Amino acid sequence: TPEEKLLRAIFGEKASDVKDSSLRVPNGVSGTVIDVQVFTRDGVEKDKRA
Amino acid sequence: EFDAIKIALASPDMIRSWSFGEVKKPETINYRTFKPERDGLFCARIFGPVKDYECLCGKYKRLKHRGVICEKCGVEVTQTKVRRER
Amino acid sequence: VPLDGGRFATSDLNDLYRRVINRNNRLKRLLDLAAPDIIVRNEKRMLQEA
Amino acid sequence: TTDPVRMYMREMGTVELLTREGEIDIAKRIEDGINQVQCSVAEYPEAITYLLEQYDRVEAEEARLSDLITGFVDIDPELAREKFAELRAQYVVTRDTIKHATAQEEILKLSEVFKQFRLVPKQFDYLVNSMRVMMDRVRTQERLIMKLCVEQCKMPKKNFITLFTGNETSDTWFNAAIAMNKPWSEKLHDVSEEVHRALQKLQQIEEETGLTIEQVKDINRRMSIGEAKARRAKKEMVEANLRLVISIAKKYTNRGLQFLDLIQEGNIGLMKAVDKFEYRRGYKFSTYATWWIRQAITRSIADQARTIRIPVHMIETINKLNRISRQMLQEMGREPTPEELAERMLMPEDKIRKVLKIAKEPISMETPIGDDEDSHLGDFIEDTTLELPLDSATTESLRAATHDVLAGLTAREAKVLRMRFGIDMNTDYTLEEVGKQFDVTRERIRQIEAKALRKLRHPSRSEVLRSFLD
Numbered sequence: 001t002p003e004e005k006l007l008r009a010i011f012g013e014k015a016s017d018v019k020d021s022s023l024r025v026p027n028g029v030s031g032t033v034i035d036v037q038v039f040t041r042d043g044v045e046k047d048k049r050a
Numbered sequence: 051e052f053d054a055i056k057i058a059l060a061s062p063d064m065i066r067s068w069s070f071g072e073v074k075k076p077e078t079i080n081y082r083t084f085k086p087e088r089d090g091l092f093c094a095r096i097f098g099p100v101k102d103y104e105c106l107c108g109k110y111k112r113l114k115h116r117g118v119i120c121e122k123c124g125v126e127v128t129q130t131k132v133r134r135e136r
Numbered sequence: 137v138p139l140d141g142g143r144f145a146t147s148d149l150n151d152l153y154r155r156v157i158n159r160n161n162r163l164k165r166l167l168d169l170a171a172p173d174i175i176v177r178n179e180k181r182m183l184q185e186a
Numbered sequence: 187t188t189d190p191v192r193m194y195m196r197e198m199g200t201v202e203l204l205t206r207e208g209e210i211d212i213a214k215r216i217e218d219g220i221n222q223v224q225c226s227v228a229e230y231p232e233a234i235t236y237l238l239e240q241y242d243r244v245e246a247e248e249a250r251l252s253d254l255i256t257g258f259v260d261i262d263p264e265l266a267r268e269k270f271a272e273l274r275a276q277y278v279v280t281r282d283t284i285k286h287a288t289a290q291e292e293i294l295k296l297s298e299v300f301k302q303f304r305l306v307p308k309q310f311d312y313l314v315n316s317m318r319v320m321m322d323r324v325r326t327q328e329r330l331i332m333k334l335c336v337e338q339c340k341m342p343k344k345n346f347i348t349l350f351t352g353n354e355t356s357d358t359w360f361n362a363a364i365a366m367n368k369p370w371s372e373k374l375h376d377v378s379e380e381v382h383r384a385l386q387k388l389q390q391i392e393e394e395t396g397l398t399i400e401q402v403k404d405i406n407r408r409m410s411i412g413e414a415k416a417r418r419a420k421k422e423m424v425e426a427n428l429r430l431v432i433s434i435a436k437k438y439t440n441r442g443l444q445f446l447d448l449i450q451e452g453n454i455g456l457m458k459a460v461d462k463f464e465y466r467r468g469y470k471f472s473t474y475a476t477w478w479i480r481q482a483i484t485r486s487i488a489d490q491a492r493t494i495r496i497p498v499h500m501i502e503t504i505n506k507l508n509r510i511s512r513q514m515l516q517e518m519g520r521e522p523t524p525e526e527l528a529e530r531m532l533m534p535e536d537k538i539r540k541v542l543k544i545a546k547e548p549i550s551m552e553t554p555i556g557d558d559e560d561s562h563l564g565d566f567i568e569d570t571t572l573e574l575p576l577d578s579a580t581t582e583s584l585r586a587a588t589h590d591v592l593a594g595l596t597a598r599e600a601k602v603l604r605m606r607f608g609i610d611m612n613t614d615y616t617l618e619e620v621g622k623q624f625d626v627t628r629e630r631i632r633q634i635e636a637k638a639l640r641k642l643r644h645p646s647r648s649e650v651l652r653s654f655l656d
């Protein structure tokens with residue numbers, strides 16, 4: 001918008017280009033993690049945790 | 051804003067007055083790009099743009115062009131909420 | 137509307153509308169072939185049903 | 187009954203199936219009719235000239251030699267060129283010899299030699315349409331003349347038959363008739379100008395044709411007889427093949443397209459075969475029809491079946507993939523995987539992924555998911571284009587803060603910054619235009635803008651603004 005431009009120009013903050021779509025605990029719930037399991041497709045890298 | 055509601059039969063001329071264009075083809079959207087087709091049920095030239103203030107091609111993309119009809123597409127650059135009343 | 141997983145959800149009206157257009161188009165086509173009246177009458181009955 | 191299919195069955199079942207001899211005689215009637223129309227059109231010297239023009243234009247390499255003409259009634263370009271040269275020679279010798287009794291035989295010979303040639307269906311249709319348009323214009327002129335001279339003047343039809351018929355070309359039958367001492371003749375004076383102009387156009391057209399208009403009417407009537415005969419023969423052929431088409435349609439019943447839609451698409455395919463069938467090859471009709479009927483039904487399924495239309499080639503790819511997957515499931519055991527399917531097929535295996543990813547039919551928004559209070563799938567789908575009210579409140583707060591900060595600064599720099607961006611103004615400008623209104627040479631505007639940015643950079647001058655920043 002014509003104003004976020006001014007703020008960016010003043011502080012020289014840059015853009016992201018990626019969102020923050022991550023899994024987070026639903027509000028009001030407090031437990032401990034007892035298990036994590038990862039299912040990767042047959043053509044994916046299988047990072048260190050997997 | 052008003053004080054009564056009147057109901058009646060609609061003439062062919064009135065039905066043509068409401069409309070913004072004729073739907074000719076039975077198509078809806080593209081199977082690869084997911085964009086509306088030229089005269090389908092979902093069509094930008096008839097029912098308005100699919101994003102706030104920007105033509106379908108992408109040539110015009112700001113409210114400094116509000117209200118202009120694109121030369122290459124025909125899609126008016128307006129609010130997409132207009133696609134809910136045309 | 138698009139749902140998660142590359143799958144769409146649609147209203148029934150779209151379906152119904154499509155029917156009309158299809159049959160309507162066919163009628164306009166059939167009258168250009170001067171087809172025998174039995175076929176055109178069948179198409180008009182189908183359009184009325186649609 | 188209420189089923190359209192029931193009524194179609196009733197109205198269809200009344201006609202009996204043709205036998206071999208029946209089909210043969212219908213075909214020969216069709217051939218005779220088309221031959222009649224062809225001969226009728228052959229008597230028009232105005233189409234040979236257009237054909238010559240097209241041949242010359244193609245000789246200028248505007249198109250292909252073969253495409254212009256579908257061969258002759260006889261295979262090599264040399265023979266076609268020789269025949270064209272002969273046609274041109276005959277045409278010129280006939281045209282340059284109008285001077286009347288002898289020109290008729292020359293025109294007859296030209297028509298006879300021309301008849302040896304064959305024309306493409308599209309170009310023949312165009313020629314027929316042009317001739318019909320000319321005839322329609324002439325008839326419209328005649329009908330306008332009749333309306334002007336009859337309804338306005340109550341001119342008896344007997345006088346028109348006696349006068350108009352016989353010459354049809356000169357204006358005597360009207361101008362001389364004006365002096366017949368009759369009320370219609372005296373009334374014609376007011377409408378004499380319109381009649382005169384119509385007769386001028388009639389004379390021009392008749393000169394263009396160069397033949398008696400009575401011959402034109404006879405030719406049109408004979409062509410109409412041929413067309414009616416051809417259409418009636420086609421109509422007779424159609425019905426037995428309708429009973430044929432219903433079975434092919436049965437074989438495709440449940441594919442997302444209604445039964446009656448399939449039947450109607452099959453009916454267009456039978457009509458397409460009929461017009462393109464031949465008894466010479468001596469192949470029973472059903473064999474020739476079935477292929478076109480099936481092709482039409484399959485293309486109809488490829489086009490109409492899906493809401494998000496998928497091209498025909500992609501539909502063929504999907505069907506082939508399904509067939510190979512079925513074979514591999516039956517044979518190999520558990521189920522083919524995309525890698526195995528790609529191996530059995532021949533594709534980069536990334537195309538196979540896309541083909542498998544092509545979305546199936548959309549889920550109806552009324553599907554009864556709810557199972558409680560009769561809730562449906564459409565009640566659970568949110569609107570993601572809306573702006574949260576906190577976002578709008580923040581936008582207004584930022585607008586107020588920016589207004590305040592700019593008000594803090596002086597006037598010239600305030601407006602320089604404001605116009606540099608779109609702040610409070612719909613339009614946007616750059617250094618060049620900004621220099622125009624402040625009488626500046628594009629330098630001291632960039633320096634002013636930098637100075638304003640520096641000043642706003644100062645702490646304790648802009649802190650709420652820094653707060654708005656994430």
Ligand SMILES: CCC[C@@H](C)[C@H]1CC[C@H]2[C@@H]3[C@H](O)C[C@@H]4C[C@H](O)CC[C@]4(C)[C@H]3C[C@H](O)[C@]12C
Binds near residue numbers: 549554563
């Ligand atoms: C079965 C009882 C009613 C209801 C719970 C069933 C009936 C059909 C089910 C949907 C479709 O099957 C498949 C859709 C796409 C994905 O495959 C998973 C999601 C998807 C919307 C499903 C959600 C739900 O599960 C539905 C609505």
Ligand SMILES: CCC[C@@H](C)[C@H]1CC[C@H]2[C@@H]3[C@H](O)C[C@@H]4C[C@H](O)CC[C@]4(C)[C@H]3C[C@H](O)[C@]12C
Binds near residue numbers: 139140555556563567
């Ligand atoms: C009775 C409660 C059923 C509920 C547990 C499950 C079963 C199927 C789920 C819906 C489907 O996935 C289809 C959609 C997917 C999109 O992401 C938008 C949400 C969407 C409507 C889902 C919301 C919810 O998660 C549903 C209703």
Ligand SMILES: [Zn+2]
Binds near residue numbers: 121
């Ligand atoms: Zn455009």
